[PDB]
Amino acid sequence: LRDLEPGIHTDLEGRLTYGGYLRLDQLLSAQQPLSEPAHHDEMLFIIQAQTSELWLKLLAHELRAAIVHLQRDEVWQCRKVLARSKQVLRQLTEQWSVLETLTPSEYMGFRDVLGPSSGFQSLQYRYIEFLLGNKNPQMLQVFAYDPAGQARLREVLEAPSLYEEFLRYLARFGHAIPQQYQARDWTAAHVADDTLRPVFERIYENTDRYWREYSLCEDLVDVETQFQLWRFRHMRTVMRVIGFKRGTGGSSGVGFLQQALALTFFPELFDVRTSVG
Amino acid sequence: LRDLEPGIHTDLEGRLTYGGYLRLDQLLSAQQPLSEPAHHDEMLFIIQAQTSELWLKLLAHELRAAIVHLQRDEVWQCRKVLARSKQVLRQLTEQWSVLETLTPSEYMGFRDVLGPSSGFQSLQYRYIEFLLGNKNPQMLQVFAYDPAGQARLREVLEAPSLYEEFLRYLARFGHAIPQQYQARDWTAAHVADDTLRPVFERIYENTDRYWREYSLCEDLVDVETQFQLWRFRHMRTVMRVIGFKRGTGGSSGVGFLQQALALTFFPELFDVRTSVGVDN
Amino acid sequence: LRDLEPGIHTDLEGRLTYGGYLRLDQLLSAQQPLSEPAHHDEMLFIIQAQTSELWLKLLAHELRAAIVHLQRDEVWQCRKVLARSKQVLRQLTEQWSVLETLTPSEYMGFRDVLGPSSGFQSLQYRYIEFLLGNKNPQMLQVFAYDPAGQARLREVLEAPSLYEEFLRYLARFGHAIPQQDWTAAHVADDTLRPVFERIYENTDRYWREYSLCEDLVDVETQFQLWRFRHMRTVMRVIGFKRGTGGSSGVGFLQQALALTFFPELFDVRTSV
Amino acid sequence: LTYGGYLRLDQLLSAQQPLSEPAHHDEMLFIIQAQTSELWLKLLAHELRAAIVHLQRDEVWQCRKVLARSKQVLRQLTEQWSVLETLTPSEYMGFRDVLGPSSGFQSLQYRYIEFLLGNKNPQMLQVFAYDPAGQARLREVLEAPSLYEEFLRYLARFGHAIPQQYQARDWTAAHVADDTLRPVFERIYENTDRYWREYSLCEDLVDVETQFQLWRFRHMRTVMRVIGFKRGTGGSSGVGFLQQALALTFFPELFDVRTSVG
Ligand code: HEM
Ligand code: HEM
Ligand code: HEM
Ligand code: HEM
Ligand SMILES: N[C@@H](Cc1c[nH]c2ccccc12)C(=O)O
Ligand SMILES: N[C@@H](Cc1c[nH]c2ccccc12)C(=O)O
Ligand SMILES: N[C@@H](Cc1c[nH]c2ccccc12)C(=O)O
Ligand SMILES: N[C@@H](Cc1c[nH]c2ccccc12)C(=O)O
Ligand SMILES: N[C@@H](Cc1c[nH]c2ccccc12)C(=O)O
Ligand SMILES: N[C@@H](Cc1c[nH]c2ccccc12)C(=O)O
Ligand SMILES: N[C@@H](Cc1c[nH]c2ccccc12)C(=O)O
Ligand SMILES: N[C@@H](Cc1c[nH]c2ccccc12)C(=O)O
């Protein structure tokens, strides 16, 4: 039994309210299941994908701000933004546990309705792959229906990635970074650089001296590990919902998702492990 | 690098698209922060609550189908929907971990833009409270500025709660349940009932005979516990973000949320703990 | 400011206490770090493995009891026990986030104290692997140093796995299970395809079998998730170095990730 | 040198002795849950002492890294309530009786941490008179500054207007909320760019406190579903007494300050 407290605002007709702020007429009218007749499991499928897109939208928002901080040598602010980015990635990774309550026989009841639609065609996800530095320009042909989107990806292809922004940062602080990281063709995905090995060994072996750099390396390594966790959980959900069936978007499915899982964002950070003392 | 596989569809201009299926133009233009100049932390804020509203939207949809299964005595199917249900609640509780990177000085550059806006005004939240049985008609009067959703809250206010559908299910199976659960003024929140004590002791003490009922008992305790934890984590974030300031919605804040934490949805379930044996 | 209630027992001078009951003296004296001087990270290292061994111990206990309920056609009870088993795998998966605060320059301070010791020689771990059906008789050799434990492991190798007991349950219920030495891995069987297809295609008749099939998919998935977090933790801390146990490291762990406990469960998704 | 030998797994894995006759299936969950928790509480103490030693030395980045691991331990501790909640009250009733008066209220390590964090209650030492040398370990943590008091000493070296009280004093008393720290915390939260170090430390302690309150709450919610409103084996009222610890605050001034910032 809880009594309405005095002082709670109740005439709200000419004022800003929660659904108005949050644009919830528009937000909560965006779920349009297409099964005929309605499948109970369709609503889950939509919500799960939409909550992920909202988190990915926020993750983009925070990564951009982390890059701006790095550029300005604002390390504590960068790392704070990065901690929120890791929490976002963690929420993403945690929501697979809802979709694990979707069995393949439930799925076959509406998989049909989706046609060729696939997360492979997520503009926001591809933006983030590109921003972390996994720059594949084949992936621009996917967005040929969409000139504005393909054009916002081109801007990210054309700019240094998160990692390349860290290398530039390191350069400004007298670490032995090649001049090529100051200007080069950024559309070309970072190639593993053996000469960065002694740089990262020197960081991790004077953590007293290179406390900021060592902090940032461990952040980046956290970011990558969490994104790979996201990919693995997605891929395990695939295995349990469609098995080894080809995807809606035309790919081989599990084997195609496995090829991303093999790839590495920040290669010299992990390579340094065989030699660090 | 990963090479684009040969069989990928790239020409989708006349077919159902991911973005059109998920109505992404619409969804990702619902974020309209009001700070001037722009505040970095406002988008976290809107997105935290928006993803919560989407989860709460999925939660009312599973809750409903759980009731329909209860009504039809479809118990395995009911428990399967409650398991999805508890996972939604479990994400809703886990996302608190993101907002806990919002400090009070951050929050202070935009809390003003909100005016009176408060999750206290969340229609879906209240729809679920009322559905789990916390039916307070004083809540209808906070929605008078919106007759349509006021009307939706009355439809649920007037139907049996989830708990009350459970008691009805027990009734159909020969358990010793009072006749009022058959027909009563469903708009009065359930009062704790001492006659249900021997019912639940019987279930918990003979789990081989009453396994279905027993497993559903534990589902509802799970559901209540997960919702308490959402409440508690929301309250703990209130304390770290605004301390003991009054809420934007007019309440005294933490103290006001503390009184909801004190409430219990399924009281005879927890009360039985005091007297239960020994499984036979 | 919290006052002690009158009523609270404060003279335990001769009674059963928390610590006497839990044997906390013997649990809490079991952390024996070898660094000279002490390395602050060694304690993490030790406790992380030990909580995990305690959880592996609880999982072996729960899984045997799921098998017993299964032998007995006690399906609700079997799933209740698979529910706790899942939660125990879930703690095992979660605690990886602590050891992920260990950096490689930290670890190089005491890695060498450890000699050849490795979770590869975790007896409880391997007990679980054999239980879930990943039986490799070559594993017995690594415990020849410990014949009580070696022989106990051999007893699990020669009994039906959790998966084999499910299939045998299905047989007692009129499922077209083949009439067909448990120490060999279970070879995948395309004649089980239609058995699984029938289960998933009429959930209202085979709701019990359907539930359990889904409980085993969950367990396998949670287990793979464990292997993956351990493996990603391996890449962050030793990269591609050879393991202390003498293996290739991440490579040898990847070969385990590619393995499947319940092949025909996953296989049936292509035809359902 | 083996895994099993390195980790003392013979004494570790024979420390589980259920007392129920005939043995109860659920007794092993029960034992393991409290034992894993104890091993985590042992790590948590090992880390927070280290973090105090870093603060004493003005080593902020090292202190923050150990507080990062410490939150992760608190996190496993809170998460594990999910296994224990598969135990139903009728299952518990099968072995509750073997337990006598034993209670987590007698956890030495829990109490060590309560006292480090600075909820010092000298009343507690009595519970432990049966173990006189563990009672004296406790008294050593009652006599030293808390983690919070060491933070306030840190601020004082660095030019914050911290009272003279906190330079030395009778640490055996719970810290008593102090209004004069308010302008202190306001300066810090209002000039993050100046006091980024202090600001981030302030936010870490708020994270430790919240997570510890979350452990308390999930423990309390478990006690409800398992024994409900019954008295505890240790002799308290049970839920009501635990609810009294939940209303306690470790670091009042950090939460008090939300009232006036910005
Ligand atoms: C159980 C439901 C799901 C199944 C069966 C599934 C399956 C697949 C398959 C087979 C692919 C490869 C592309 C293709 O051929 O379609 C794919 C890619 C993808 N999915 Fe899903 N997926 C599911 C849910 C989701 C959800 C909820 C999200 C969140 C938005 C998501 C995001 C992605 C993304 C971003 C890719 C591109 C991955 C890459 O390019 O490496 N998927 N998925
Ligand atoms: C950090 C941000 C938040 C703060 C400071 C906060 C604070 C408050 C306060 C002070 C109240 C009491 C009503 C009033 O006077 O305003 C309230 C209620 C509520 N908030 Fe929040 N809230 C926050 C975030 C959220 C979010 C993200 C959600 C998303 C679900 C949410 C959902 C609710 C709900 C449903 C209530 C009503 C609870 C009840 O009636 O028992 N809040 N909150
Ligand atoms: C920094 C921590 C760790 C590293 C660098 C590590 C490394 C390794 C490596 C390299 C192997 C392969 C065999 C070898 O050559 O030694 C292995 C196997 C193993 N580790 Fe770890 N491990 C770590 C922590 C842990 C923890 C905390 C546990 C918990 C028990 C664990 C359990 C295992 C198990 C069970 C195996 C064998 C798995 C199989 O045979 O497929 N490890 N580990
Ligand atoms: C079914 C499980 C449990 C029940 C029914 C339970 C019940 C209680 C009760 C009633 C109390 C208050 C004192 C008393 O009368 O004994 C208590 C205290 C305590 N329990 Fe538990 N408990 C449970 C599990 C656990 C576990 C797994 C731990 C892990 C270490 C734990 C740690 C504690 C601690 C540290 C206290 C004292 C807290 C304080 O002084 O504020 N408990 N428990
Ligand atoms: N990277 C982990 C642990 C950590 C905290 N501070 C650090 C400083 C340096 C290296 C690692 C850390 C985290 O950010 O939570
Ligand atoms: N690509 C997925 C389909 C999918 C999963 N989630 C989605 C969300 C929207 C559109 C399609 C999807 C499959 O092969 O089945
Ligand atoms: N309620 C817990 C444990 C459980 C599983 N099956 C049960 C059957 C009856 C009672 C409890 C249970 C869960 O669903 O995880
Ligand atoms: N009640 C909150 C305001 C709030 C929190 N989250 C929200 C989401 C949307 C609108 C308003 C809010 C406060 O008192 O500060
Ligand atoms: N496998 C999931 C979802 C589930 C619940 N009950 C089921 C019955 C049948 C199939 C799947 C389920 C779980 O155990 O929570
Ligand atoms: N095998 C690990 C060492 C290891 C990790 N956890 C352990 C626990 C106990 C003994 C050894 C270990 C390595 O290659 O470095
Ligand atoms: N307290 C959170 C958020 C955070 C990270 N860095 C910070 C610096 C200042 C204040 C808060 C933070 C954490 O430790 O991750
Ligand atoms: N205090 C508990 C008993 C208890 C719970 N967990 C424990 C672990 C060890 C010893 C006793 C306990 C009760 O009232 O039932």
Is the separation of the CB atoms in D180 and D163 below 8 Å? Answer: yes
Q: Are C82 and C215 in contact (CB under 8 A)?
A: yes
Length of chain C, please? 272
3.90.600.10, 3.40.1010.10, 1.20.58.480, 3.40.50.300: CATH of C1-272: 1.20.58.480
What is the CATH number assigned to the segment(s) B1-280?
Answer: 1.20.58.480
DSSP structure class, residue C37: S
A134 vs C62: CA distance, rounded Å: 44
Hey, what are C184's tokens? Answer: 């060999």
Q: Is residue C130 within 8 Å of residue C158, measured between CB atoms?
A: no
Helix (H, G, I), strand (E, B) or coil at A242: helix
Q: How far is CA D141 from CA D48, D50, D70, D111, D125, in A?
A: 12, 14, 18, 10, 11
Please give the residue of chain B at the shortest CA–CA distance from D230: B274
D1-262 topology per CATH: Methane Monooxygenase Hydroxylase; Chain G, domain 1 (1.20.58)
CA distance D147 to C234: 33
Spatial separation of the C-alpha atoms in residues D28 and D101, rounded to whole Å: 19
C-alpha distance from residue A182 to each of A166, A168, A169, A185, A252 (Å):
11, 7, 10, 10, 39
Distances (CA, A) of D49 to B146, D145, D150: 56, 11, 11
Q: In chain D, which residues are last before a break of more than 2.5 Å from C to the next N?
A: none
CB atoms within 10 A of CB C49: 19
Q: Which H or E run contains A260?
A: helix A254-262
Inter-helix orientation angle D196-226/A75-94, to 10°:
20
Question: Which tokens is C181 given?
Answer: 């030495």
How many other CB atoms sit within 10 Å of the CB of residue B32?
A: 12
Q: What CA–CA distance (Å, rounded) separates D205 from D254?
A: 9
- Select from C40, C41, C101, C103 the residue whose CB has the most chain A CBs within 10 Å, as the one to mutate to test that interface: C103
Q: What is the DSSP letter of A8?
A: -
* Ligand 10 pocket: which of D1, D2, D3 to mutate (most atoms within 8 A of CB): D3
Give the helix/strand (H/E) hosting C121. none
| Terminal-residue alpha carbon distance, chain D | 59
Judge whether C205 is closer than 8 Å to chain B, CB to CB: no
CA–CA dist D231, C7 (Å, integer): 10
Q: What's the Cα-to-Cα distance from A252 to each of A118, A245, B168, B212, D144, rounded to whole Å?
A: 13, 7, 49, 42, 63
- Determine contact: D75 vs chain C, CB below 8 A: yes
Residues of D in contact with B197 (CB under 8 A): none
**Residue at A275: amino acid letter:** S
Q: How far is CA D142 from CA C225, D100, D119, D147, in A?
A: 43, 29, 9, 12
Output DSSP code: residue A3.
P
Q: By the 8 A CB rule, do D151 and D64 touch? A: no
CA C246 to chain centre: 22
CA distance B255 to B269: 26
Count of Cβ atoms closer than 10 Å to residue C147 Cβ: 10
Mention every residue, 6+ apart, whose C-beta is less than 8 A from residue B225.
D85, D221, D224, D225
Paired tokens of D24: 């109860």
- CA angle centred on D120, ends D114 and D123, rounded to 5°: 110
CA dist list (Å): A33 to A44, B22, B23, B253: 10, 9, 10, 38
Which residues touch A91 (CB under 8 Å, ≥6 apart)? A55, B51, B91, B94, B95, B97, B98
Token code pair at residue A190: 């970072």
Please name which of B194, B124, B128 lies closest in space to residue B161, comparing C-alpha atoms.
B128
Pocket of ligand 10 (CB under 6 A): C 49, 111, 114, 117-119, 238, 243-245; D 3, 6-7
Phi, psi of C104 (to 5 degrees): -70, -20
Measured over the CA atoms of residue C3, residue C5, residue C6 and residue C9, the dihedral's sign is: negative
**Is the sign of the CA dihedral D87, D92, D98, D101 positive or negative?**
positive
Q: CA Rg, chain B, in Å?
A: 22
Cα–Cα distance, D70 to D43 (Å, whole number): 8
Most informative mutation of D99, D109, D222, D237 for ligand 12 (most atoms within 8 A of CB): D99
Q: How far apart are CA B188 and CA A221, in angstroms?
A: 55
A-chain residues near D196 (CB < 8 A): 76
List, in sequence order, the alpha helices (H) in chain B: 18-21, 24-27, 42-71, 75-94, 96-99, 104-108, 123-131, 147-157, 162-172, 196-205, 211-241, 254-261, 267-271
Residue type, C164: E
Q: Where are the domains of chain A?
A: 1-277
End-to-end CA distance of chain B: 62
Say if CB D222 and CB C87 are below 8 A apart: no
Q: For chain C, state the CA radius of gyration.
A: 22
Which residue type sits at D247? A
Is A150 an interface residue toward D (CB < 8 Å)? no
Joined together, the tokens standing for residue A257 give 């998702």
For residue D61, count CB atoms less than 10 angstroms from its CB and return exposed for 0-12, middle for 13-18, buried for 19 or more.
Answer: middle
Report C:10-49 residues touching D (Cβ under 8 A): 10-24, 26-32, 34, 40, 43-44, 46-47, 49
Phi/psi at D198 (5° precision):
-70, -45
Rounded CA separation D171/D141 (Å)? 9
Phi, psi (rounded to 5 degrees) for D191? -140, 65
Tell me which residue has tokens 């302690």.
D205
Task: Give residue for tokens 């806990």.
Answer: B100
User: Which experimental method was this entry solved with?
Assistant: X-ray
Q: Which residue on chain C is closest to B83 by alpha carbon?
A: C83
Closest CA to B87 of D82, A108, A33: D82
By C-alpha distance, which of C119, C133, C90 is closest to C225?
C90
Task: Give the SS3 label for residue C244.
Answer: coil
CA dihedral for A131, A134, A138, A142, sign (positive or negative): negative
The two tokens of residue A62 are 């925070």
Measured between alpha carbons, how far is residue B36 from residues B48, B109, B112, B118 in Å?
21, 10, 11, 21
Q: How many CB atoms lie within 10 A of CB B25?
A: 10
Residue closest to B108 by CA, chosen among B51, B161, B45: B45
Compute the distance between CA of residue C163 and CA of residue C215 in angstroms, rounded to an integer: 11
What are the phi and psi torsion angles at A183 (to 5°)?
-165, 130
Task: Write b or e for each residue in B234-256: b if 16 or more Cβ atoms lie within 10 A of its Cβ, otherwise e.
Answer: bbbbbbbbbbebebbbbbbbbeb
**Cβ neighbours for B261, distance < 8 A, ≥ 6 positions apart:** B228, B231, B232, B235
Please say whether the beta carbons of A3 and B258 come within 8 A: no
Sequence-ordered strand ranges (E) for chain A: none
Kindly provide the b/e burial profile for residues D104-127, where b requires at least 16 CB atoms within 10 angstroms of the residue's own CB: bbbbbbbbbbbbbbbbbbeebbeb
CA–CA distance, C223 with C205 (Å, rounded to integer):
29
Whole-number Å distance between alpha carbons of D192 and D157: 18
Give the three-class secondary structure for B58. helix
C80 contact B CB<8A: yes
CA distances from D81 to B216, B245, D108, D179 (A): 20, 32, 20, 37
Backbone angles phi, psi at C11, to 5 degrees: -110, 95
Name the residue at shortest CA distance from atom 1 of ligand 10. Answer: C118
What is the token pair recorded at A244? 């080894």
CA distance D76 to D72: 7
Cα angle C202, C205, C206; round to 5 = 80
**Residues in D touching B243 (Cβ below 8 Å):** 255-259
**Cis? peptide before C137, omega within 30° of 0:** no
Q: What does the alpha-carbon distance between residue C107 and residue A273 come to, in Å, rounded to a whole number? A: 11
CB contact at 8 A, C66 and C85: yes
- Å from CA of C34 to ligand 3 middle: 19
The answer for residues whose C-beta is within 8 angstroms of residue D167's C-beta and 6 or more apart is: D153, D156
User: What counts of helices (H) and strands (E) characterise chain A?
Assistant: 13, 0
DSSP string, chain D: --HHHHTTHHHHTT------SSPPTTHHHHHHHHHHHHHHHHHHHHHHHHHHHHHHHT-HHHHHHHHHHHHHHHHHHHHTHHHHTT--HHHHTTTGGGGTT--GGG-HHHHHHHHHHT---GGGGGGGTTSTTTHHHHHHHHHSPPHHHHHHHHHHHTT----GGGGS--TTS-----GGGHHHHHHHHH-TTTSHHHHHHHHHHHHHHHHHHHHHHHHHHHHHHHTTTSPPTTSS-SHHHHHHHHT--SSHHHHHGGGT--
Which residues in chain B are contacts of C211 at CB distance < 8 A? 76
- In whole angstroms, what is the distance from residue B261 CA to residue D239 CA? 14
What span, in angstroms and rounded, lies between the C-alpha atoms of B266 and B190?
9
Give phi and psi for C39, each to the nearest 5.
Answer: -110, 125
Return the CA Rg of chain A.
Answer: 22
Q: Read off the tokens for A245.
A: 């069936």
Contact indicator for A109, A41 with CB cutoff of 8 Å: yes
CA distance D231 to chain B (A): 9
Residue B253 has which token pair? 């804040």
- Distance from the Cα of residue C251 to its chain's centroid: 20
Say what the alpha-carbon torsion angle D41, D43, D45, D51 is, to the nearest 10 degrees: -140
> At how many Å resolution was this determined?
2.2
Judge contact between B253 and A2, C-beta under 8 A. no
Stretch (H or E) spanning A202: helix A197-205
Asked whether D132 and C45 are in contact (CB, 8 A), the reply is no
The separation between CA C267 and the C-alpha centre of its own chain, rounded to angstroms, equals 23
CATH of A1-277, one of 1.10.3720.10, 1.20.58.480, 3.30.565.10, 1.20.1070.10: 1.20.58.480
Mark D27-56 as b/e (b = at least 16 C-beta within 10 Å): bbbbbbbbbbbbbbbbbbbbbbbbbbebbe
D242 alpha-carbon distance from chain centroid: 14
D227 vs B: CB within 8 A: yes
A234 sits in which H/E element = helix A211-242
Contacts of B45 in chain A (CB under 8 A): none
Cβ proximity of B96 and B237 under 8 Å: yes
